[PDB]
Amino acid sequence: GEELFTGVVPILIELDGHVNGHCFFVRGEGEGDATIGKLSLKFIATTGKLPVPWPTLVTTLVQCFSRYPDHMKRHDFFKSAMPEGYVQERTIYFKDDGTYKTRAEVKFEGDTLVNRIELKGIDFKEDGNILGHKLEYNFNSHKVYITADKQNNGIKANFTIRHNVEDGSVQLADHYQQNTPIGDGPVDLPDDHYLSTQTILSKDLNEKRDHMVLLEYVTAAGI
Amino acid sequence: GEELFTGVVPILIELDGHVNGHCFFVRGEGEGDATIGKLSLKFIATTGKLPVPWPTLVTTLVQCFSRYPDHMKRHDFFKSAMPEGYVQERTIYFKDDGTYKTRAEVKFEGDTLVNRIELKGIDFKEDGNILGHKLEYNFNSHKVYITADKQNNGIKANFTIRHNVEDGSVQLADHYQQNTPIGVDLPDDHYLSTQTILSKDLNEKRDHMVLLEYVTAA
DSSP states (O other), rough: GGSSSSSSSEEEEEEEEETTEEEEEEEEEEEEETTEEEEEEEEEEESSEEEEEOGGGGTTTOOGOOOOOOOGGOOOOHHTTTTEEEEEEEEEEEEESOOOEEEEHHHEEEEEEEEEEEEESSSOOOOOOOTTOBOOOOOOOOEEEEEEEEGGGGEEEEEEEEEEESSSSSEEEEEEEEEEEESOOOEEEESEEEEEEEEEEETTTOOOOOEEEEEEEEEEEEE | OGGGSSSSSSEEEEEOOOOOTTTEEEEEEEEEEETTTTTEEEEEEESOOOOHHHHHTTTOOOOSSBBOOOGGGGGGGHHHHTTTTTEEEEEEEEESOOOOEEEEEEEEETTEEEEEEEEEEEETTTTTTTTTTTTTSOOOOOEEEEEEEEETEEEEEEEEEEEEEETEEEEEEEEEEEEEEOOOOOOEEEEEEEEEEEEETOOOOOOOOEEEEEEEOO
């Protein structure tokens, strides 16, 4: 499990989403390097202009690439579930607005790590920050708090994404996460700890499709 | 099963589709009356302008509402699978063009009959009759040939939809169909005689399809 993530690993991401009365599909490719905790990915909206802001999809669009330092490696659930993988389910409550529900499967296909997701959004306000496109194309840094879940032989996670808004205000998004192991074996049930995330969103300037070029760095701590 | 379809029954149709890079979702509502073999419905493209012609959708957007006369009622699979319902899978080959694959679930939710579908289209030519929107807004009448399928305790159907083209050129669509029970009658070889009208509800600015259909078994 652990030693599948030495060296640069290619990544495929696929997101099928329905929000309110809109649909979209977003595919992404790139590479992951868990020794340094880094992702670089390019995402494309194959269905044309996204009906929701790119930043609202970041957390949905592969935490097995977080850097777990030597003393922390006995708490790395994500890598220990591999190669068979895990299911990642979330409910994301945007304050004073709608909700995303998501179900993803993270696993290896050949040497490529693939994250295939379905997303349903409901009860979004028209001309809220989401459907009204009022969110700045930027990302902040967060702590993803992780606790063992014996009931599922799995982990729970909680955290609040802060999404900067046009008006200087901030749009909060409460994430309530659940992960499990697709196959039978030993997945590591960790002490309460967290992931420290940082992310940069930019845009390939000679790409005329709706897209997102991301840069990320994630490391575990808190023990 | 059978006697769930006496009287007018409300219908919900849910359609999710991906076709050559475009996505779309269609919802439809209306009523069905199997005693007369009738099913009026209004469909709406919630995702905006449909990337494919409405008529191609026909044959995917509830055959439990076909009229089976007294002498034919022992051959009505669709109604006998209720209330639990059936899966309806199809492959639709548009001649000299792409292909729709579909998987639907037809079943009762409360007293409403629901048909929830997923549709994948592939290998469509970009300026064909489908992606190029060259099909007239209409429908013709057809025979849906039905044979029992004991391997899957269900039925297999085959028929060819004729879609009129603006250039007085007809676009054929070969339907291969397979129905199984989520929970059953296994019928003699017979068929459904279908008739359909497609219209628009003036005063509606969304992309839509009003449909009237009359179907009887023979």
